[PDB]
Design a protein around this nucleic acid. Structure first.
Ligand SMILES: Nc1ncnc2c1ncn2[C@@H]1O[C@H](COP(=O)(O)OP(=O)(O)OP(=O)(O)O)[C@@H](O)[C@H]1O
Ligand SMILES: [Mg+2]
Ligand SMILES: [Zn+2]
Lengths: 163, 617
DNA sequence: GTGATATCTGCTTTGGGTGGGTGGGTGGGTTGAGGCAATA
DNA sequence: AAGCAGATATCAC
């Protein structure tokens, strides 16, 4: 999966009140607003159809350098202390960057697209890659399915039982 | 007898076309092809519709609009065009096929207005039926006068003569069929379906019945996507029709004498004269002959190149950075060894198996995909399988019949080819036990309810595996990092490891390679040899069976003694035979006829680095 | 007197279990209980 | 009971 998102239920009271007001308003929404939303949806569908028809973004030189530096920095984060990234993620970035370029109806992928892709990827990871014990940077949970702290604890348990 | 002017004119013009149409080289294109029809197994001639259109447009239009009407006359013209040669019996029948029809129709465009016209369609074959002999013209004896009637045409129903030939005879009911002087044609019924590309959105697929005849029988297989050229016809409900020789067998039209009080319905079937794929005993000399002169000199130049090993390695795997040893091992696997049979009838395996153990996102799947795309016969699969067959056979029960049948696995489908297995460590226990025999004996044996079989699995296996912990631990040995058992590991000729090197320079190289591949898809790739060149060269090289010389014998014996003295993993005779296989593959790589000591040295280098990697951290 | 052509006569049909499972389920019949292989 | 295959006597020209 390119992006994994977490939809958690908050314990906050203010969130509950705001969502309640949202749902009540929707429960009383008027027909003109519904028609307006339908028109906006039709516009969105037409926009996507046109973009698929005629837009084929390509990587510019600045986008290429941005992507290479982005991958190097993601690796550096882990290398400072483990591994914090793997090459497959770079591919994801490329895809996302291209998608962003298509939203602007642009045939060239620019640095803004790369920045948006990095932000979105980093937000998804912060949502779903967090180790409840220590922190986030650990992506070993995705690659191996086992938290690094959990791996160390299991190694300790096995060594002790081997004692 | 009344004469059909249009059909006779078409016959004459088609004979003229066959006689006179000229190829680019100036020879008669179809004379040389008809020269092949002297063989007993050949009865069909394939004619390009574009050639006919160039020769005579009115003839082509008439054929297109009256194909069903005029096809027998075209076949008669072909018979005349072949009559000169002495080898053809007078009884042989010949049929015409039409290859390249410029326009195509969809299966849902096959309406009543297309009945009898020449058409081309595409479809995916769902089912094929057994071959039958079909009567086309019967010879009958008259029981009243003993006169012989010949050339009685058949119309979807077993038909006897209407009146006796003899003017004096008035018989209408009593005749005898004589098989030996009747004419039959090969017949096959296939059921095809709309392709996924053609299937309209949110619609149930529409199926069609196709009839193949003569050479076209057994030329399409279920699951294939095929182009059919032929005609759309109506087939009446035979069960309703009664004839003097054949009683009726248990709305539509009414009023025919053969109908009694019954009704006759019709259904549409496609009568195909040509089948092709929609997207299209060997020996070294024959392989050479199949090639053109340019291709042969390219193959020879490749055989003479002194850097062939490295050039081939780089050409096969251009997207992967580093890992030269793995590329060399996979190449040697692709060339293969020499399978042999003993005097007592037992087999010595000649195929090579390779295993790649890797960290996450280390491009092992990339190796498997490159091999899969390159090889003509190759199956890519996963250790954890979606079907019950898995990598080997399974036994499943047909609910209706209650019968038990074999469902083939990946290693069966890859017989005589390459099987790329990903996640080789996730196999199930049944596959795990069966893979011993599959990998060494190259057979799969089953004795279960309703099934007793030995199935062929002559395959080369390229496997990709993950370490037990999910990350490779250099402190431990390779045997300590994977969950493969020692007997399974002994069945692999070569082992390779791909470790995630937490190095800035490697990261910078890999990122640049990936981004360059994406930025310039066409410009990034630079191969010393094209993939087609390598495919032809491999086809040529697999025909060599290099012989082991005496000096290579001594070197191999000494190397095996050294390996055993050096050493639940252990050096077995399997390592010796793996060394033999690798030496044979090294010799084959250079289209050589003898295994020289140099090939043994290279093979031993590779195998020694594999064994040491297996043993020590 | 020969060629229709109108009348008359005998066969067998139906799906069915007294017509078989030594015909065959690619010739066609709901419901339940009982072995398999793969399954968990 | 209903309908096709076979047999056969019968009108017409
Ligand atoms: N050495 C390398 N050279 C070039 N590309 C590489 C290299 N290592 C990794 N990659 C890139 O990584 C991706 C390959 O990931 P792939 O799916 O093949 O990994 P894997 O080894 O099968 O791992 P996993 O099964 O855990 O996903 C591609 O983007 C490939 O370009
Ligand atoms: Mg993979
Ligand atoms: Zn006769």
């Amino acid at each position: 999966f390119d992006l994994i998102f977490l939809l958690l239920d908050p314990q906050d009271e203010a969130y509950d009140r705001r969502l309640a007001h949202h749902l009540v308003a929707l429960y009383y929404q008027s027909e003109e607003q519904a028609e307006e939303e339908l028109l906006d949806m039709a516009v969105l569908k037409d926009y996507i159809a046109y973009a698929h028809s005629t837009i084929m973004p390509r990587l510019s030189e600045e986008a290429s350098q941005a992507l290479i530096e982005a991958y190097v920095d993601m690796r550096k984060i882990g290398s400072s202390r483990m591994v914090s990234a793997y090459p497959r993620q770079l591919e994801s970035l490329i895809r996302l960057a291209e998608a962003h370029a298509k939203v602007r109806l642009s045939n060239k992928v620019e640095a803004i697209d790369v920045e948006e892709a990095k932000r979105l990827h980093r937000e998804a990871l912060k949502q779903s890659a967090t180790d409840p014990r220590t922190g986030i940077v650990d992506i070993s949970i995705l690659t191996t399915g086992m938290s690094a702290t959990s791996r160390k604890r299991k190694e300790e348990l096995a060594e002790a039982l081997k004692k | 007898e009344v004469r059909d002017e249009v059909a006779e004119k078409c016959q004459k013009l088609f004979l003229d076309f066959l006689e006179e149409f000229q190829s680019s080289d100036g020879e008669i294109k179809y004379l040389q092809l008809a020269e092949e029809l002297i063989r007993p197994e050949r009865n069909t001639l394939v004619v390009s519709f574009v050639d006919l259109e160039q020769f005579n447009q009115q003839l082509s239009t008439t054929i297109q609009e009256e194909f069903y009407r005029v096809y027998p006359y075209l076949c008669r013209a072909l018979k005349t065009f072949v009559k000169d040669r002495k080898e053809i019996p007078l009884a042989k029948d010949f049929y015409v096929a039409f290859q390249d029809l410029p326009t195509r129709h969809k299966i849902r465009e096959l309406t009543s207005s297309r009945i009898g016209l020449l058409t081309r369609i595409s479809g995916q074959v769902v089912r094929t039926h057994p071959v039958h002999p079909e009567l086309v013209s019967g010879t009958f004896l008259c029981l009243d006068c003993q006169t012989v009637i010949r050339d009685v045409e058949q119309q979807f129903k077993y038909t006897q003569p209407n009146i006796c030939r003899n003017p004096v005879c008035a018989n209408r009911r009593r005749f005898l069929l004589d098989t030996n002087k009747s004419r039959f044609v090969d017949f096959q019924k296939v059921r095809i379906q709309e392709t996924q590309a053609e299937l309209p959105r949110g619609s149930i697929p529409r199926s069609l019945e196709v009839i193949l005849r003569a050479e076209a029988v057994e030329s399409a297989q279920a699951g294939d996507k095929c182009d059919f050229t032929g005609t759309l016809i109506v087939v009446p409900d035979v069960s309703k029709l009664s004839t003097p020789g054949a009683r009726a067998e248990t709305e539509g039209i009414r009023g025919l004498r053969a109908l009694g009080v019954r009704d006759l319905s019709y259904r549409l079937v496609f009568l195909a004269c040509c089948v092709a794929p929609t997207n299209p005993e060997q020996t070294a000399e024959s392989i050479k002959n199949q090639m053109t002169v340019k291709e042969w000199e390219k193959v020879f130049e490749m055989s003479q190149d002194k850097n062939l090993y490295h050039n081939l390695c780089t050409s096969l795997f251009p997207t992967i950075h580093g890992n030269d040893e793995v590329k060399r091992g996979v190449l040697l696997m692709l060339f293969g060894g020499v399978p042999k049979t003993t005097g007592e009838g037992t087999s010595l395996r000649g195929d090579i198996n390779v295993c790649i153990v890797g960290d996450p996102s280390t491009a092992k799947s990339q190796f498997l995909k490159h091999v899969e795309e390159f090889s003509p016969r190759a199956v890519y699969t996963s250790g954890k399988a979606s079907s019950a067959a898995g990598l080997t056979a399974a036994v499943v029960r047909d609910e209706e019949s209650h019968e038990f049948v074999i469902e083939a696995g990946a290693l069966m489908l890859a017989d005589n080819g390459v099987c790329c297995i990903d996640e080789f460590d996730k196999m199930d226990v049944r596959d795990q036990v069966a893979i011993h025999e599959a990998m060494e004996q190259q057979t799969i044996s089953i004795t279960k309810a309703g099934v007793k079989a030995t199935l062929n699995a002559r395959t080369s296996i390229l496997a990709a595996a993950n370490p037990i912990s999910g990350h490779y631990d250099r402190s431990k040995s390779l045997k300590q990092n994977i969950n493969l058992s020692a007997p399974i590991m002994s069945r692999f000729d070569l082992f390779f490891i791909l470790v995630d090197e937490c190095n800035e320079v490697t990261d910078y190289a890999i990122a640049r390679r990936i981004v360059d591949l994406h930025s310039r898809i066409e410009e990034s790739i630079d191969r010393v040899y094209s993939l087609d060149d390598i495919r032809r060269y491999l086809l040529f090289a697999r025909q060599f069976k290099p012989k082991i010389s005496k000096e290579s014998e001594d070197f191999i014996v000494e190397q095996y003694k050294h390996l055993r003295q050096r050493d639940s993993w252990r050096i077995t005779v399997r390592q010796l035979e793996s060394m033999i296989r690798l030496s044979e593959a090294m010799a084959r790589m250079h289209c050589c006829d003898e295994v020289q000591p140099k090939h043994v040295k290279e093979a031993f280098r590779l195998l020694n680095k594999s064994i040491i990697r297996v043993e020590t951290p």
